[model samples]
Target chain A: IHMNSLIKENMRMMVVMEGSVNGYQFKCTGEGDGNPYMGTQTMRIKVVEGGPLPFAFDILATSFSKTFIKHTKGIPDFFKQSFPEGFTWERVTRYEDGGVFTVMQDTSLEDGCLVYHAKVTGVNFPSNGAVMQKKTKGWEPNTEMLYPADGGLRGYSQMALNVDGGGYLSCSFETTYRSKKTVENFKMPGFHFVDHRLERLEESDKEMFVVQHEHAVAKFCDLP
Target chain B: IHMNSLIKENMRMMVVMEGSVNGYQFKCTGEGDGNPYMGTQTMRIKVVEGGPLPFAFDILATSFSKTFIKHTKGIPDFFKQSFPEGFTWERVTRYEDGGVFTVMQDTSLEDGCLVYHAKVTGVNFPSNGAVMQKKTKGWEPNTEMLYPADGGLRGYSQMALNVDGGGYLSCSFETTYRSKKTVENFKMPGFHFVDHRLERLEESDKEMFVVQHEHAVAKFCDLP
Candidate 1:
């Protein structure tokens, strides 16, 4: 098995949708020929500092989804109402064909987390021996931007709280089955990004957040 | 397959040694006919309130060990030195045979979390057609009470922190393969206990604990 085969054989392959999707942020960045149809793209990720702490919990909640790469439910409206703009992050991709095709389908947010869930299929052939090929992409049903459901968007996040009230957050995202070769064996090649963020919460802010959401926090902490 | 067979076939069989072993606390309670050899025993569990908050983290850290039923590293001496005697929680157990043999092996702690890791094998037969029987027990290597390592002490614990500084902790413990019947196919017959505890940390206490362990806590929370 090629290195790609190893990834396809052992890793959960999924697609990544970068940039602003429905106003939510997908922190991973993507670069390509702007073809929109097919070709390869280089994707890199950088965690946004304090880019919505709620994302950590939301991602952790679905880390073990049955489908593996399911989209996040996005930040709830309650949180959105506070930090509506989300974060100023970036975009990221997949592929197909004789060409190491990398493509972009779409993305979304679920439960305060930003993720992309989609499928790509490329129908390639030779036109008049000129060799004309075209690649296509589609979003997983319900995973449609306006009201997403489920698809490829794997994420693993970790959060650590400091005794002094500060903390840190880190998350990884990867996509699967990008092209025909990969799709044949569920290959997740070269679409891995890890984002790390510094969590800064002042003692005063911690006190205020705690006081403001006492009941909500109590649901998880206080017990009889 | 009998219900016992179902347990043995589908679950990781192990053994539990209730009561105080060494100086650590097990937190699960065990009751029996006081038969040092065998017979059934009723094991019930209850969470100790404000017993020791550190146990939650310690248990969480080892939840995914390859050898599922490994013992905890016990509360570090750093914590022991401060709290001296750990918690006032009780103990729990496992069994064998047609007489429903229950046994009390031993127990201990690891990384502040109390756990039991051991094994048991019982040999029984009718004595001179008198219908008399005999049973035996033993511990997994290194899992010996005095200097423990690993065996059968499966635990799963959850901890949630309240914004207001309060918290909640819950844990479950189960032992497997207690007797000839169970050992045949790894049956885990009726040995399960769940414990829940309320975590109360006053602002002052939190401040002090945090301030005193600033460096250690920093290792987990602070990031570049």
Candidate 2:
């Protein structure tokens, strides 16, 4: 298989966001063409010293199978889909205070995802912080939906946290799946990804986790 | 699959050996029956202040996965294999220093290929001091096998590490594949762990990783 057939991805996103770690600051300086829709050549990562630190270990991952990339040798039209032109989103926090994010989607990142980044400078809102969030049901039906034409809701999906006494952190500079791939196979030709962690985290919820606990523990740990 | 049918595993091992995180003192009192071969009714886990602290943020895991229950409801028997008769294992550090561990595996906890811990106390060994490990051929023929009948090694398989200047550490609590069930179907009930980190770490060497590099780079972060 082309190594590409198995899967691989390179990305460069530079956002002057907030937060750093271990008393060090960081700058997200991902070198790119700078034009979201245009093509760029390098993807060098230097976790440089400049952003505010929250253990600075915040850029984690997702539920969508951000799997094997088939190609990025050619890049283009990254944000032209759903809010194709562009959009404004809000984060209604449980802390009662709220936030508004302005987002931009540039040329494509993957076959279906965009070079999208959301930025937040300041947030002010009422504190529904914890209580209101607990009240939400999955997919709170669209009558509570924002647009009459489109029944879906507008929301913030990811939240990053700082370590220890650093407490809850506020962040800027981020991105996500632009919205399902438009490219058919949307993957490079040879690479394959077999990481199934989310699936297993789910497996634990099933009743059988009880027995797994019973058998595996004894067979290995000498638990007796 | 009987949950146990799939080669999954959950384990929590508590041992009170000394020598640890941040030069602080620790106590390993996991409330199991304290028996090496019996079962316990409760599996409550607290990242207790008593465990002392070693960058306590040290072993962080995933979410919902982190509920207090992630703390222990996922418990199981910790050690019930080879050492059931109770034994002493010797560790020869790179410094040619020697230390021994006395262990008792009680009940277990978690669904992790990670949460494994090892413990040891009062190392009569030469060094609380740091100066250690080595390099070896694929199989350093074990004419020196501790067990002459079985041509395999009875040794420490993994090593613990700290990222930066938090410098050298001695781990007192740990467990390994006591090797009886290197599982043909080694997984636990209902859970499936599909971590292939070693595979790609190998791929980094392929003539293909270059293209995999070129292609993957454009797709995510840059690779110079």
For all predicted structures, in order, the TM-scores are: 0.21, 0.21
What candidate 1 gets wrong by more than 4 Å, as runs, is A1-27, A30-43, A46-224, B1-85, B88-224
Query: Considering just chain B, what TM-score does every model have?
Result: 0.19, 0.27
User: What lDDT tens digits, residue by residue, belong to model 2 across residues A98-195?
Assistant: 43233232332444233433332223322343211222111100000010111212222222222233223222222232333333323212111111
Q: Highest DockQ among the candidates is held by which one?
A: 1
What value does DockQ give for candidate 2? 0.01
lDDT of 1 by residue, B1-224 (tens): 12332111112212232222122233322111111111111222222222232222122111100111211222111111211121111122211112111223323333333333322221231232111211111110100011101222222122222111121111122222112121223322121212123222221331212100000110111112
Give the best candidate by lDDT: 2
Per-residue lDDT over A43-122 for candidate 1, one digit per residue giving the tens place of the 0 to 100 score: 12222322332122122111101111211222221111212121111112211112111223433223333334422221
Q: Which candidate leads in TM-score?
A: 2
Kindly report the docking quality category of candidate 2. incorrect
Error of 2 at B118 (Å): 42
